[PDB]
Amino acid sequence: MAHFKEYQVIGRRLPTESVPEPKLFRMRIFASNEVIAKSRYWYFLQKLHKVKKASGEIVSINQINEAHPTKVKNFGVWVRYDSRSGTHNMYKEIRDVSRVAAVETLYQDMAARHRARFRSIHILKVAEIEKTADVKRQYVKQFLTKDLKFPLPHRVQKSTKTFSYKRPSTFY
Amino acid sequence: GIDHTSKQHKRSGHRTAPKSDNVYLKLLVKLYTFLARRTDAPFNKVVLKALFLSKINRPPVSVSRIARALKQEGAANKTVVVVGTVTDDARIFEFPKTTVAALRFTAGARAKIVKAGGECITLDQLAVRAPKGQNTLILRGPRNSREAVRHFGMGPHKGKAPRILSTGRKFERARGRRRSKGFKV
Amino acid sequence: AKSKNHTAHNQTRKAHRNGIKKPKTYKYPSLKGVDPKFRRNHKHALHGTAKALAAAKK
Amino acid sequence: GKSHGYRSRTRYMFQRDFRKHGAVHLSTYLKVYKVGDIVDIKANGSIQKGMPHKFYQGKTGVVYNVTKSSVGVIINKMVGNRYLEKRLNLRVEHIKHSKCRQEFLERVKANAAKRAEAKAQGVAVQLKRQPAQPRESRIVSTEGNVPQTLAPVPYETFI
Amino acid sequence: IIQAKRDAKAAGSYYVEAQHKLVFVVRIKGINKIPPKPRKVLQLLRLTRINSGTFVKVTKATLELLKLIEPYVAYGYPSYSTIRQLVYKRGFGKINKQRVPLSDNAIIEANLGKYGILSIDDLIHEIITVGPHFKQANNFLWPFKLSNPSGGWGVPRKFKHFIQGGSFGNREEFINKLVKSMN
RNA sequence: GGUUGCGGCCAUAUCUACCAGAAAGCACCGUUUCCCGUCCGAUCAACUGUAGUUAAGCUGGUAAGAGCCUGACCGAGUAGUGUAGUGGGUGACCAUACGCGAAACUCAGGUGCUGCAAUCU
RNA sequence: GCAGUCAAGCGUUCAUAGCGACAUUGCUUUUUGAUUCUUCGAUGUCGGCUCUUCCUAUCAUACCGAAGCAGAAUUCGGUAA
RNA sequence: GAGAACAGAAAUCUCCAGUAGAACAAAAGGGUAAAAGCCCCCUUGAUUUUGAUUUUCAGUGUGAAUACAAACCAUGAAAGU
RNA sequence: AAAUAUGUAAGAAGUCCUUGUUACUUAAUUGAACGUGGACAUUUGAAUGAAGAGCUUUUAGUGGGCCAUUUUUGGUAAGCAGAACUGGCGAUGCGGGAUGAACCGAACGUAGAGUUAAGGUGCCGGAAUACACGCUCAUCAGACACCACAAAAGGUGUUAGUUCAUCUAGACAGCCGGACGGUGGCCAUGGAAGUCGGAAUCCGCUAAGGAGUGUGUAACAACUCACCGGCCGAAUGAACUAGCCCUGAAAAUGGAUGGCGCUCAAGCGUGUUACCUAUACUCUACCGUCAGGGUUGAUAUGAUGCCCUGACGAGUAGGCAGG
RNA sequence: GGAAUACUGCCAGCUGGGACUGAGGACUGCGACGUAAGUCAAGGAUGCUGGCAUAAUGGUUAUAUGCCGCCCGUCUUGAAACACGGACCAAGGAGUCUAACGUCUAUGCGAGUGUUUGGGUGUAAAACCCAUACGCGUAAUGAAAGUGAACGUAGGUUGGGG
RNA sequence: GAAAUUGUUGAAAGGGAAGGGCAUUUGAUCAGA
Ligand SMILES: [K+]
Ligand SMILES: [Mg+2]
Ligand SMILES: [Mg+2]
Ligand SMILES: [Mg+2]
Ligand SMILES: [Mg+2]
Ligand SMILES: [Mg+2]
Ligand SMILES: [Mg+2]
Ligand SMILES: [Mg+2]
Ligand SMILES: [Mg+2]
Ligand SMILES: [Mg+2]
Ligand SMILES: [Mg+2]
Ligand SMILES: [Mg+2]
Ligand SMILES: [Mg+2]
Ligand SMILES: [Mg+2]
Ligand SMILES: [Mg+2]
Ligand SMILES: [Mg+2]
Ligand SMILES: [Mg+2]
Ligand SMILES: [Mg+2]
Ligand SMILES: [Mg+2]
Ligand SMILES: [Mg+2]
Ligand SMILES: [Mg+2]
Ligand SMILES: [Mg+2]
Ligand SMILES: [Mg+2]
Ligand SMILES: [Mg+2]
Ligand SMILES: [Mg+2]
Ligand SMILES: [Mg+2]
Ligand SMILES: [Mg+2]
Ligand SMILES: [Mg+2]
Ligand SMILES: [Mg+2]
Ligand SMILES: [Mg+2]
Ligand SMILES: [Mg+2]
Ligand SMILES: [Mg+2]
Ligand SMILES: [Mg+2]
Ligand SMILES: [Mg+2]
Ligand SMILES: [Mg+2]
Ligand SMILES: [Mg+2]
Ligand SMILES: [Mg+2]
Ligand SMILES: [Mg+2]
Ligand SMILES: [Mg+2]
Ligand SMILES: [Mg+2]
């Protein structure tokens, strides 16, 4: 729904006299802020366990920063989404420097290719593929060849002015 | 836009001056406006309000009513204040000596009070004697005794005096007024 | 020509303009439907209580 | 044509609470009703005399009269834009004592006791009920309770 | 609070901060086409005009009111800075109801001094810490008449929930930024 | 603790199939002059408490018993549903947000409790 | 009224050259209904004659594809008014 | 369901099971099992007086109904009805 | 057996203690009702609000309604006909939806400034030919809810996925070689040899071959394929799923994403900012209305006056007031 | 292991530019600074300066330009309507008066009230004056015959302004 | 000796109506200190 941050959200299923110290369930939620993070936490906990916001509590919320924000990684992403006619599971691969950037790319890509809005997508799993040759999508694999170089043909520079006096060039 | 919780520009619904154009009544209202503003006297405030009242809201107070009010325990020496007309009553035979301040006195009422040995004063004389309404006793006539009142709220099983011009047999007494003709009320 | 038959449309708005009024509770409510035997004896009990309370001022 | 009888549309309302048909138990008749008692009306379909109209099913009122087998109940019926006083003559099988005020009476007694013990022990009253307050801070331990990480489950049909 | 959080983390526990006792609620919806129950709740919270705001002491009885009026209000947890700026700039008191600006501490003392509130900072304190006389101090405060936000609402459409990219509902800590831009 | 008389709640008390029951009580059981009622002293009435019996009633126990009752993060926060959007979808319908929240199912447990009076190994 | 989709069958064999049951999706407003929104201080109410234009769901003419097209004739279909 | 001459599917006699699967004037719904059903006994409360109340409702009328009061009765051992 | 909706209660007309009346009631000063006297005001017993609350009289107009979401009945359906709750229109302008009674936003005294709503920012036209990731090329592209339509069924168009398979012990495609024997397998048939049919789906040689995938004959024959090999050398096949696009897709004057026009968009999905502007919001001024107040202590003539303070201002039918 | 920085939030931190506004009209207040005097940005604009001294500003009017603006009245759920009336203008043109009444208000008198049928009188339809009646009210109720309003401090209880 | 309607003169505007609102240019005209 915006530029994403990843939050660990831990909730409780609030204690009673019968059950003190309940079982402290945790989730990694990609959300643009903490209100949405906690909302998504309760949404998925209600999908998983007999609990709701009114019968539980948020024990903790903590943003998780990328441990290595400046190393390029290949992420495998497993999602579950609703199409116009059904629900489907999908696996994709995204090359980027952080989980939040990978997830933002994934949401953009789901919207672009499957018209799957945010509300229709569940992030099942995001995991860095530590070993290349376990990358199984060609659109990522092509970026892992040795000494990868490519030109950027047909450069289009934007003019600051309405009129130009030169009949410009697209060389690069 | 504002979601008004009440009627906007609603008038208070109370008189702030007499409808009367009596210049003397307006002078009394001026005096008691001054007093009510600058005395902190509940008596002065209620007398100022009473000076605005219409005629049917100022029912006459009879000397009988005054005598009963004075027979009240401890009231025998209080000055009786009637914002309205004091009327005479021949049904009483022993009127007490008292001071009565009233807007108007009937000839017979003034005569009875003075013959009993009291005084009939005006409301400005009352204001001079008791600017805070000391030792006063405000009397009010029987408002809900007007002939018009007995027709108010007419309806089935109300018992409220139909509006009628001629009374007697043949005049609104047969069907709807007895069980032998259809039903009763 | 047929017309509309019935609707409660606007009725609650009309009723709430002057508001639904609670019926002005009173102490000493009327004894209208009360058992006439109880009422007959209550009159005598009250007359006796009044006489006693009057005589009790000596 | 249309049909609005006295017991129209009462088919389920006046039924006998399945496997609770038959004779009315004796506590219903052993109950004692005084003028001023607050009663809930629930018609017993097996007692066709002294039966309330369907409007008064689930209504709560005040006993104003007591007769041989019945009580007079005062209900405030909403008609038009105001309330009208209705006086029903209901047999005791159609009314029960209301517990809408037992909590109030118990609070009254506890409040008197607390006020007495307070003006005997010190100075504090706190006699007004309070709404459920926001929770206070707490420390939640992980000893034996290390957080388990859940993830959304993939779709499947299991049909 | 900071030290308790650090100590719980150092002890391997989680410090669950206390639930918020005070909310600020701003009516973000106009006065047309409001269903009767939300409209009555708005009138009882004194939000009778768009961009009017009030402080609400959080209980069950008031949380169930906020629940009803959620699509018409943005609310959240006000900070001390937000409350202080609200009372300083847009603080008005009810004296013969007379919407009197809180320009001097004498007015606050004359109307709330019987509760121990002698100054505008006494009032702010009784608001931020929900004191024994919060009801009287908050009712003495005239509903705050805020402007539209100065940098916009931050969203293209206001009338979906804050969680769904809109403006209404609980925006818990971002109410401070919204109210600061509205003040 | 058993039993009777009167009971309260009216199955955790009911139903089916077996087994056990000391004391007392209850019961079956014996009789037909009287009161009474019957086609029939079977029921009902009366008399005896004597001739007999725990066979039955009754009480309790047993049963991976039927039913019933209780509870549950069991199913299920599912179905449904209040509120919201210039959400999706041609539509049928659906997703999401803020709330409320079943029934079936599954499992575990249980199988009358008790008031007044009298009486009893 | 016109047109699709599926394809059990017809077509000596062969589902689809040409057809096509049981179903099912549509389109059109040259049928007739349904409605009563406009017109009852009045829009002249059948048909024909005359004349112009428009549509294409094409009868013919042009050029074509298909056939259970040898020729001839015909049939199905495309661009086409 | 199990039995008894004529007598069988239907006659009358007997036992067992039987929560109502019958009956209660009529339409339907509700209600009812030592009864509200069936049979028997006695009866006229289907009476008198004039109020209150509920539904329809304007809180008018009419119809119907509810609970009392004041009498006279019926029934039952009685409470009661 | 919900959700929503709904009755009642949350106190001084209360609670507790004692004891007077009665012709009612009890076996009974038993009880019932009403009292006398005595005790209990910081929270007098939840929350929030309260331009106050209560009460009365008297009259106008109206008594054709319609629309939207949701619930819902009849009907194939309807801009149809009928109900429920709410909100609207009527009775209402204003910004937006080009246009439009009802939709969105917001309701209106006269002005100024600022900020916004909904909606927009290529040009018309105020406002980024903004930024970012993708998708789409339509010889009928598409382009913002109400709303001014399109479906089933299809497409090696293109994109992204799911699952199952083959593959250096050599896969797919391609070219070439083999594709037999028992055997004219059994039955029938007028004839039927793998191939008009029913049934049986065997065995050997086998690297491999179906009692046969098709063409063919009257039956033959003869070609051909499953199946296995030769060549090549790294990937490949099948069935599904759903995005955009295309086919499906035919009407009458010439015409409508509003127009122009737009194709790494000015289209579609999504994300982030900046910006534009309503009679809305904020502040101020002025007009009026209402409310609360001050001021008869004098020269002082407008106390129905003068003055202070706060709030408000839509309007048909209609009422009233001041002119 | 030690930092930095981002992000978010706070400051009764400092400070530059731009726009609109200047209501009020002796003093009174709350403050600030100052040792105190006094001063101040503290209950609303002052100071300095220039040009003009009239069509210059402004008003009015015609026109032009930008954007907007359907024909009123009427019935109607809905009118600019392809609904009706209206070619134009002047003058006329439609809730009146009366008998009897309801509510409310003003006035006079008040258990009474109403002089004006009539009489007297007059400066002559005026004004002024007046007897007896009569009307309404002071008593209701019943079909009627008829009867007819204090147990009491004209009652008790609860609330009740003063 | 009004208006409708009309002549003349003067002024002004005028691509399939005219009229109107806000604002200002221009021309004409004018009060106030
Ligand atoms: K016509
Ligand atoms: Mg009608
Ligand atoms: Mg029920
Ligand atoms: Mg800005
Ligand atoms: Mg917006
Ligand atoms: Mg025997
Ligand atoms: Mg016997
Ligand atoms: Mg035995
Ligand atoms: Mg069992
Ligand atoms: Mg909406
Ligand atoms: Mg119609
Ligand atoms: Mg004509
Ligand atoms: Mg014509
Ligand atoms: Mg064609
Ligand atoms: Mg019986
Ligand atoms: Mg009837
Ligand atoms: Mg009409
Ligand atoms: Mg109308
Ligand atoms: Mg509107
Ligand atoms: Mg449009
Ligand atoms: Mg522009
Ligand atoms: Mg499709
Ligand atoms: Mg052959
Ligand atoms: Mg298309
Ligand atoms: Mg555009
Ligand atoms: Mg986009
Ligand atoms: Mg403005
Ligand atoms: Mg005033
Ligand atoms: Mg107005
Ligand atoms: Mg910063
Ligand atoms: Mg000028
Ligand atoms: Mg226009
Ligand atoms: Mg019409
Ligand atoms: Mg019109
Ligand atoms: Mg038309
Ligand atoms: Mg006409
Ligand atoms: Mg005409
Ligand atoms: Mg005229
Ligand atoms: Mg002349
Ligand atoms: Mg002329």
mmCIF file with all atom_site columns, all heavy atoms in Angstrom, chain I residues 213-217:
data_model
loop_
_atom_site.group_PDB
_atom_site.id
_atom_site.type_symbol
_atom_site.label_atom_id
_atom_site.label_alt_id
_atom_site.label_comp_id
_atom_site.label_asym_id
_atom_site.label_entity_id
_atom_site.label_seq_id
_atom_site.pdbx_PDB_ins_code
_atom_site.Cartn_x
_atom_site.Cartn_y
_atom_site.Cartn_z
_atom_site.occupancy
_atom_site.B_iso_or_equiv
_atom_site.pdbx_formal_charge
_atom_site.auth_seq_id
_atom_site.auth_comp_id
_atom_site.auth_asym_id
_atom_site.auth_atom_id
_atom_site.pdbx_PDB_model_num
ATOM 1   P P     . U I 1 213 ? -5.299  -49.087 -33.682 1.00 0.00 ? 213 U I P     1
ATOM 2   O OP1   . U I 1 213 ? -5.126  -48.988 -32.211 1.00 0.00 ? 213 U I OP1   1
ATOM 3   O OP2   . U I 1 213 ? -6.639  -49.390 -34.247 1.00 0.00 ? 213 U I OP2   1
ATOM 4   O "O5'" . U I 1 213 ? -4.779  -47.730 -34.330 1.00 0.00 ? 213 U I "O5'" 1
ATOM 5   C "C5'" . U I 1 213 ? -4.117  -46.756 -33.538 1.00 0.00 ? 213 U I "C5'" 1
ATOM 6   C "C4'" . U I 1 213 ? -3.803  -45.517 -34.338 1.00 0.00 ? 213 U I "C4'" 1
ATOM 7   O "O4'" . U I 1 213 ? -2.441  -45.577 -34.827 1.00 0.00 ? 213 U I "O4'" 1
ATOM 8   C "C3'" . U I 1 213 ? -4.635  -45.307 -35.592 1.00 0.00 ? 213 U I "C3'" 1
ATOM 9   O "O3'" . U I 1 213 ? -5.916  -44.765 -35.325 1.00 0.00 ? 213 U I "O3'" 1
ATOM 10  C "C2'" . U I 1 213 ? -3.746  -44.398 -36.429 1.00 0.00 ? 213 U I "C2'" 1
ATOM 11  O "O2'" . U I 1 213 ? -3.835  -43.055 -35.977 1.00 0.00 ? 213 U I "O2'" 1
ATOM 12  C "C1'" . U I 1 213 ? -2.355  -44.935 -36.083 1.00 0.00 ? 213 U I "C1'" 1
ATOM 13  N N1    . U I 1 213 ? -1.863  -45.910 -37.080 1.00 0.00 ? 213 U I N1    1
ATOM 14  C C2    . U I 1 213 ? -1.313  -45.416 -38.243 1.00 0.00 ? 213 U I C2    1
ATOM 15  O O2    . U I 1 213 ? -1.220  -44.224 -38.477 1.00 0.00 ? 213 U I O2    1
ATOM 16  N N3    . U I 1 213 ? -0.870  -46.367 -39.127 1.00 0.00 ? 213 U I N3    1
ATOM 17  C C4    . U I 1 213 ? -0.924  -47.735 -38.966 1.00 0.00 ? 213 U I C4    1
ATOM 18  O O4    . U I 1 213 ? -0.485  -48.467 -39.854 1.00 0.00 ? 213 U I O4    1
ATOM 19  C C5    . U I 1 213 ? -1.507  -48.167 -37.735 1.00 0.00 ? 213 U I C5    1
ATOM 20  C C6    . U I 1 213 ? -1.946  -47.263 -36.856 1.00 0.00 ? 213 U I C6    1
ATOM 21  P P     . G I 1 214 ? -7.101  -44.947 -36.395 1.00 0.00 ? 214 G I P     1
ATOM 22  O OP1   . G I 1 214 ? -8.384  -44.610 -35.729 1.00 0.00 ? 214 G I OP1   1
ATOM 23  O OP2   . G I 1 214 ? -6.943  -46.276 -37.037 1.00 0.00 ? 214 G I OP2   1
ATOM 24  O "O5'" . G I 1 214 ? -6.800  -43.828 -37.486 1.00 0.00 ? 214 G I "O5'" 1
ATOM 25  C "C5'" . G I 1 214 ? -7.186  -44.004 -38.840 1.00 0.00 ? 214 G I "C5'" 1
ATOM 26  C "C4'" . G I 1 214 ? -6.274  -43.244 -39.769 1.00 0.00 ? 214 G I "C4'" 1
ATOM 27  O "O4'" . G I 1 214 ? -4.894  -43.624 -39.518 1.00 0.00 ? 214 G I "O4'" 1
ATOM 28  C "C3'" . G I 1 214 ? -6.464  -43.507 -41.254 1.00 0.00 ? 214 G I "C3'" 1
ATOM 29  O "O3'" . G I 1 214 ? -7.540  -42.776 -41.816 1.00 0.00 ? 214 G I "O3'" 1
ATOM 30  C "C2'" . G I 1 214 ? -5.107  -43.136 -41.828 1.00 0.00 ? 214 G I "C2'" 1
ATOM 31  O "O2'" . G I 1 214 ? -4.966  -41.725 -41.908 1.00 0.00 ? 214 G I "O2'" 1
ATOM 32  C "C1'" . G I 1 214 ? -4.176  -43.650 -40.732 1.00 0.00 ? 214 G I "C1'" 1
ATOM 33  N N9    . G I 1 214 ? -3.746  -45.039 -40.990 1.00 0.00 ? 214 G I N9    1
ATOM 34  C C8    . G I 1 214 ? -4.030  -46.155 -40.244 1.00 0.00 ? 214 G I C8    1
ATOM 35  N N7    . G I 1 214 ? -3.507  -47.245 -40.736 1.00 0.00 ? 214 G I N7    1
ATOM 36  C C5    . G I 1 214 ? -2.839  -46.821 -41.875 1.00 0.00 ? 214 G I C5    1
ATOM 37  C C6    . G I 1 214 ? -2.083  -47.548 -42.829 1.00 0.00 ? 214 G I C6    1
ATOM 38  O O6    . G I 1 214 ? -1.839  -48.758 -42.859 1.00 0.00 ? 214 G I O6    1
ATOM 39  N N1    . G I 1 214 ? -1.584  -46.719 -43.828 1.00 0.00 ? 214 G I N1    1
ATOM 40  C C2    . G I 1 214 ? -1.785  -45.365 -43.901 1.00 0.00 ? 214 G I C2    1
ATOM 41  N N2    . G I 1 214 ? -1.236  -44.713 -44.930 1.00 0.00 ? 214 G I N2    1
ATOM 42  N N3    . G I 1 214 ? -2.487  -44.679 -43.022 1.00 0.00 ? 214 G I N3    1
ATOM 43  C C4    . G I 1 214 ? -2.980  -45.463 -42.043 1.00 0.00 ? 214 G I C4    1
ATOM 44  P P     . U I 1 215 ? -8.467  -43.447 -42.943 1.00 0.00 ? 215 U I P     1
ATOM 45  O OP1   . U I 1 215 ? -9.635  -42.555 -43.151 1.00 0.00 ? 215 U I OP1   1
ATOM 46  O OP2   . U I 1 215 ? -8.681  -44.869 -42.579 1.00 0.00 ? 215 U I OP2   1
ATOM 47  O "O5'" . U I 1 215 ? -7.570  -43.400 -44.259 1.00 0.00 ? 215 U I "O5'" 1
ATOM 48  C "C5'" . U I 1 215 ? -7.093  -42.164 -44.764 1.00 0.00 ? 215 U I "C5'" 1
ATOM 49  C "C4'" . U I 1 215 ? -6.145  -42.351 -45.921 1.00 0.00 ? 215 U I "C4'" 1
ATOM 50  O "O4'" . U I 1 215 ? -4.932  -43.018 -45.482 1.00 0.00 ? 215 U I "O4'" 1
ATOM 51  C "C3'" . U I 1 215 ? -6.629  -43.218 -47.068 1.00 0.00 ? 215 U I "C3'" 1
ATOM 52  O "O3'" . U I 1 215 ? -7.552  -42.571 -47.925 1.00 0.00 ? 215 U I "O3'" 1
ATOM 53  C "C2'" . U I 1 215 ? -5.322  -43.593 -47.752 1.00 0.00 ? 215 U I "C2'" 1
ATOM 54  O "O2'" . U I 1 215 ? -4.827  -42.505 -48.517 1.00 0.00 ? 215 U I "O2'" 1
ATOM 55  C "C1'" . U I 1 215 ? -4.405  -43.791 -46.545 1.00 0.00 ? 215 U I "C1'" 1
ATOM 56  N N1    . U I 1 215 ? -4.351  -45.212 -46.132 1.00 0.00 ? 215 U I N1    1
ATOM 57  C C2    . U I 1 215 ? -3.706  -46.104 -46.972 1.00 0.00 ? 215 U I C2    1
ATOM 58  O O2    . U I 1 215 ? -3.178  -45.784 -48.021 1.00 0.00 ? 215 U I O2    1
ATOM 59  N N3    . U I 1 215 ? -3.693  -47.408 -46.545 1.00 0.00 ? 215 U I N3    1
ATOM 60  C C4    . U I 1 215 ? -4.250  -47.896 -45.382 1.00 0.00 ? 215 U I C4    1
ATOM 61  O O4    . U I 1 215 ? -4.163  -49.098 -45.122 1.00 0.00 ? 215 U I O4    1
ATOM 62  C C5    . U I 1 215 ? -4.899  -46.915 -44.568 1.00 0.00 ? 215 U I C5    1
ATOM 63  C C6    . U I 1 215 ? -4.930  -45.639 -44.961 1.00 0.00 ? 215 U I C6    1
ATOM 64  P P     . G I 1 216 ? -8.726  -43.417 -48.627 1.00 0.00 ? 216 G I P     1
ATOM 65  O OP1   . G I 1 216 ? -9.286  -42.603 -49.734 1.00 0.00 ? 216 G I OP1   1
ATOM 66  O OP2   . G I 1 216 ? -9.618  -43.935 -47.561 1.00 0.00 ? 216 G I OP2   1
ATOM 67  O "O5'" . G I 1 216 ? -7.980  -44.668 -49.270 1.00 0.00 ? 216 G I "O5'" 1
ATOM 68  C "C5'" . G I 1 216 ? -7.253  -44.547 -50.484 1.00 0.00 ? 216 G I "C5'" 1
ATOM 69  C "C4'" . G I 1 216 ? -6.646  -45.864 -50.892 1.00 0.00 ? 216 G I "C4'" 1
ATOM 70  O "O4'" . G I 1 216 ? -5.807  -46.371 -49.824 1.00 0.00 ? 216 G I "O4'" 1
ATOM 71  C "C3'" . G I 1 216 ? -7.630  -46.991 -51.153 1.00 0.00 ? 216 G I "C3'" 1
ATOM 72  O "O3'" . G I 1 216 ? -8.212  -46.920 -52.441 1.00 0.00 ? 216 G I "O3'" 1
ATOM 73  C "C2'" . G I 1 216 ? -6.780  -48.235 -50.934 1.00 0.00 ? 216 G I "C2'" 1
ATOM 74  O "O2'" . G I 1 216 ? -5.983  -48.506 -52.076 1.00 0.00 ? 216 G I "O2'" 1
ATOM 75  C "C1'" . G I 1 216 ? -5.861  -47.782 -49.797 1.00 0.00 ? 216 G I "C1'" 1
ATOM 76  N N9    . G I 1 216 ? -6.350  -48.215 -48.476 1.00 0.00 ? 216 G I N9    1
ATOM 77  C C8    . G I 1 216 ? -6.876  -47.418 -47.493 1.00 0.00 ? 216 G I C8    1
ATOM 78  N N7    . G I 1 216 ? -7.220  -48.083 -46.425 1.00 0.00 ? 216 G I N7    1
ATOM 79  C C5    . G I 1 216 ? -6.899  -49.399 -46.721 1.00 0.00 ? 216 G I C5    1
ATOM 80  C C6    . G I 1 216 ? -7.044  -50.572 -45.940 1.00 0.00 ? 216 G I C6    1
ATOM 81  O O6    . G I 1 216 ? -7.501  -50.684 -44.797 1.00 0.00 ? 216 G I O6    1
ATOM 82  N N1    . G I 1 216 ? -6.592  -51.696 -46.620 1.00 0.00 ? 216 G I N1    1
ATOM 83  C C2    . G I 1 216 ? -6.068  -51.692 -47.887 1.00 0.00 ? 216 G I C2    1
ATOM 84  N N2    . G I 1 216 ? -5.690  -52.886 -48.368 1.00 0.00 ? 216 G I N2    1
ATOM 85  N N3    . G I 1 216 ? -5.927  -50.604 -48.627 1.00 0.00 ? 216 G I N3    1
ATOM 86  C C4    . G I 1 216 ? -6.360  -49.498 -47.984 1.00 0.00 ? 216 G I C4    1
ATOM 87  P P     . U I 1 217 ? -9.708  -47.452 -52.678 1.00 0.00 ? 217 U I P     1
ATOM 88  O OP1   . U I 1 217 ? -10.182 -46.926 -53.982 1.00 0.00 ? 217 U I OP1   1
ATOM 89  O OP2   . U I 1 217 ? -10.488 -47.186 -51.443 1.00 0.00 ? 217 U I OP2   1
ATOM 90  O "O5'" . U I 1 217 ? -9.536  -49.029 -52.810 1.00 0.00 ? 217 U I "O5'" 1
ATOM 91  C "C5'" . U I 1 217 ? -8.644  -49.590 -53.760 1.00 0.00 ? 217 U I "C5'" 1
ATOM 92  C "C4'" . U I 1 217 ? -8.686  -51.095 -53.723 1.00 0.00 ? 217 U I "C4'" 1
ATOM 93  O "O4'" . U I 1 217 ? -7.900  -51.586 -52.609 1.00 0.00 ? 217 U I "O4'" 1
ATOM 94  C "C3'" . U I 1 217 ? -10.056 -51.710 -53.499 1.00 0.00 ? 217 U I "C3'" 1
ATOM 95  O "O3'" . U I 1 217 ? -10.849 -51.745 -54.672 1.00 0.00 ? 217 U I "O3'" 1
ATOM 96  C "C2'" . U I 1 217 ? -9.716  -53.086 -52.942 1.00 0.00 ? 217 U I "C2'" 1
ATOM 97  O "O2'" . U I 1 217 ? -9.355  -53.976 -53.987 1.00 0.00 ? 217 U I "O2'" 1
ATOM 98  C "C1'" . U I 1 217 ? -8.467  -52.781 -52.111 1.00 0.00 ? 217 U I "C1'" 1
ATOM 99  N N1    . U I 1 217 ? -8.777  -52.604 -50.674 1.00 0.00 ? 217 U I N1    1
ATOM 100 C C2    . U I 1 217 ? -8.859  -53.742 -49.897 1.00 0.00 ? 217 U I C2    1
ATOM 101 O O2    . U I 1 217 ? -8.692  -54.862 -50.341 1.00 0.00 ? 217 U I O2    1
ATOM 102 N N3    . U I 1 217 ? -9.149  -53.524 -48.577 1.00 0.00 ? 217 U I N3    1
ATOM 103 C C4    . U I 1 217 ? -9.359  -52.310 -47.963 1.00 0.00 ? 217 U I C4    1
ATOM 104 O O4    . U I 1 217 ? -9.609  -52.279 -46.759 1.00 0.00 ? 217 U I O4    1
ATOM 105 C C5    . U I 1 217 ? -9.255  -51.178 -48.832 1.00 0.00 ? 217 U I C5    1
ATOM 106 C C6    . U I 1 217 ? -8.973  -51.359 -50.126 1.00 0.00 ? 217 U I C6    1
#
